[PDB]
Ligand binder design. Structure first.
Ligand SMILES: Cc1ccc(CCc2c3nc[nH]c3cc3c(=O)[nH]c(N)nc23)cc1
Ligand SMILES: Cc1ccc(CCc2c3nc[nH]c3cc3c(=O)[nH]c(N)nc23)cc1
Ligand SMILES: [Zn+2]
Ligand SMILES: [Zn+2]
Lengths: 355, 355
């Protein structure tokens, strides 16, 4: 029987590492990409913010939990909901939590953990504040300090629910904006509380890749080495490669699905916009090396035709290819680290992706 | 090696029959449902009118023909294009053909057959005029007479193209609106020319089921018994069952795909609108007996959730289920005719579908 949670590192190269997370519902190979569930992957993302509202967490629990609801019996990660509340909802912030608007709702550390319990997710995120960017040192500090108080409240709420404490895992989220001293204080606070994994929050908020990598350079080494590192909200293939080079083990990102519904396909030679007329007679698959079922069977010209015609089949094929591309990217990353040639892979990847 | 075209009737019950069409690219079991290709089926529909315009028939031929383009190596049926021109395009009609509007286009019997040749379809429809409904006897007669002149021109154009004459099949289309004498004259004209199959045109144009069935009652027996009978544009499951009872062998219909993108699922207990709140907690599959992969795996509640959330996955699952339902309907029809219990099947089908 697999454990509740066990992270093992099988190989390293520089700051990069590759290994596995064992959980009751399955093994997660790292570095991992975690696609949205409503879009092969070892874990998918649930959408706490949406599910809170439709049908409601209680209702999901009445229907048997998210695994039964979605027909997915493997691990599920849920975010804590405040990021989405603050980006999508009127909002009122206080030390207790956030209220937002049919009727009004409060979201607190305790309520966030309970919602994630009712959904039945396997990896639960602490309830944090994603500090807006840019932020002054004072505002970034005040925000991070609140998030750390909230992290302790999240820990206690999780531990109070036996079914959750015994079968799920809890990740703490580091904040501190772009400031090294605050990132250190946040890492220290999270390690004192103790979590199963550690996320780097507060990035992919408009800072750009150079700045993101700069913050990762000093921030990831502050986290416990023997625990998984999750960079929230990232990203493009080139962001993933550089974040793995800096010690990240887990990724989520809307882009594969967003791109698949909006005409963009990822390839080893960079993204392409399949609606462009240059693809109307292109008999090659979306990508020349991709092993996915779309590229085994259909051409750029046909997918172009479907998308231009407004056919649902087109977006479905684009999305299948994109998620498959991301999983091939992660497999190549894992294999290259395990083989000690990840540094060469990253250089080769970049030379070709940007050519 | 299969023949170019061979229709064999294996069993009959009343006017209903079941059998096979053999063509070079495959066997078609009848009665057959023929789904749109861009949406198991033995033949799919190409969209002549759309393909004429984007990318153009020449361009499709340059890309290797529709089979290669779509990745479908089995039979393809194409319509002749005038129905769609007259419903979707400014139009100018003459004895030569129809002109319509970027720039202008003409469609004639000769051009329609050439377009269908360039597309490479296996079953080619004659270029006809679908008479509007209602029509006076005089207008219905004038229109039908033009269609029969056009049917002869279609026959001659098809026969002039060796690759087409030797590898494809040509169907003539009966017109005559709702008038028995004109339907007879049209059938007589088509049989004198000689076709591989015979379609009943000019229905599913707003006449309603009672009137459609009334016209089928006298029209289908006018066609050669030993050739397939294709009712164009039909229809709902109950239309299909009644048309088979009246001697129809082949069906096309937008409904499965249109419905799948618009929240409607077909079930043995009738259509359901999955967006309705009554399905938000319904743990049953879309249909309790359906063998399709959607109903094996997911609930009404989950598909409702996806559609209400605007997720592409939802429409895809609805469409897969709907096309699968139609193929199960046709399999049950074929089996019940072969077993001599089709009359009982139709009564049982109706009692339940409308309960
Ligand atoms: C469905 C879904 C997908 C992804 C996410 C992650 C959302 C996300 C961020 N996205 C971009 N930058 C982000 C930063 C944070 C952050 O600091 N905290 C949290 N809790 N989430 C973040 C949430 C929900
Ligand atoms: C993609 C596609 C699907 C289906 C069709 C069939 C379109 C269709 C009719 N649809 C409803 N009633 C119809 C009558 C006729 C008719 O009399 N003639 C022709 N040529 N087509 C018909 C054409 C193209
Ligand atoms: Zn692919
Ligand atoms: Zn089904």
């Amino acid at each position: 029987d697999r454990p509740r949670f066990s992270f093992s590192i099988a190989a390293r190269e520089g700051k990069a590492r590759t290994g596995t997370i064992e959980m009751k519902r399955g093994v997660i190979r790292t570095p991992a990409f975690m696609p949205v569930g409503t879009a092969g992957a070892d874990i998918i993302l649930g959408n706490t913010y949406h599910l809170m509202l439709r049908p409601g967490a209680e209702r999901i629990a009445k229907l048997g939990g998210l695994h039964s609801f979605m027909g997915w019996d493997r691990p599920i990660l849920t975010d804590s909901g405040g990021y989405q509340v603050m980006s999508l909802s009127l909002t009122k912030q206080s030390e207790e939590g956030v209220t937002f608007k049919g009727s009004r709702h409060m979201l607190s550390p305790e309520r966030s953990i309970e919602i994630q319990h009712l959904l039945g997710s396997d990896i639960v995120m602490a309830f944090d504040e994603c500090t807006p960017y840019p932020a002054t040192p004072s505002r970034a500090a005040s925000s991070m300090e609140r998030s750390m108080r909230w992290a302790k409240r999240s820990r206690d709420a999780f531990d109070s629910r036996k079914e959750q404490a015994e079968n799920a895992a809890l990740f703490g989220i580091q904040q501190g904006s772009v400031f090294e001293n605050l990132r250190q204080q946040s890492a220290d606070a999270l390690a004192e509380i103790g979590f199963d994994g550690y996320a780097v929050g507060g990035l992919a908020v408009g800072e750009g890749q150079d700045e993101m990598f700069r913050v990762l350079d000093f921030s990831v080494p502050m986290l416990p080495d023997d625990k998984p590192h999750y960079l929230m909200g990232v990203g493009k293939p080139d962001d993933i490669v550089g974040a793995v080079e800096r010690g990240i083990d887990m990724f989520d990102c809307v882009l594969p699905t967003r791109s698949g519904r909006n005409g963009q396909a990822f390839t080893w030679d960079g993204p392409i916009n399949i609606r462009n007329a240059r693809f109307s007679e292109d008999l090659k698959p979306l990508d020349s090396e991709c092993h996915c079922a779309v590229c085994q069977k259909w051409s750029r010209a046909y997918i172009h035709h479907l998308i231009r015609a407004g056919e649902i089949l087109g977006a479905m094929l684009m999305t299948e290819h994109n998620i498959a591309f991301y999983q091939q990217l992660m497999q190549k990353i894992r294999d290259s680290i395990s083989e000690g040639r990840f540094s060469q892979f990253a250089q080769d990847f970049r030379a070709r992706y940007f050519a």
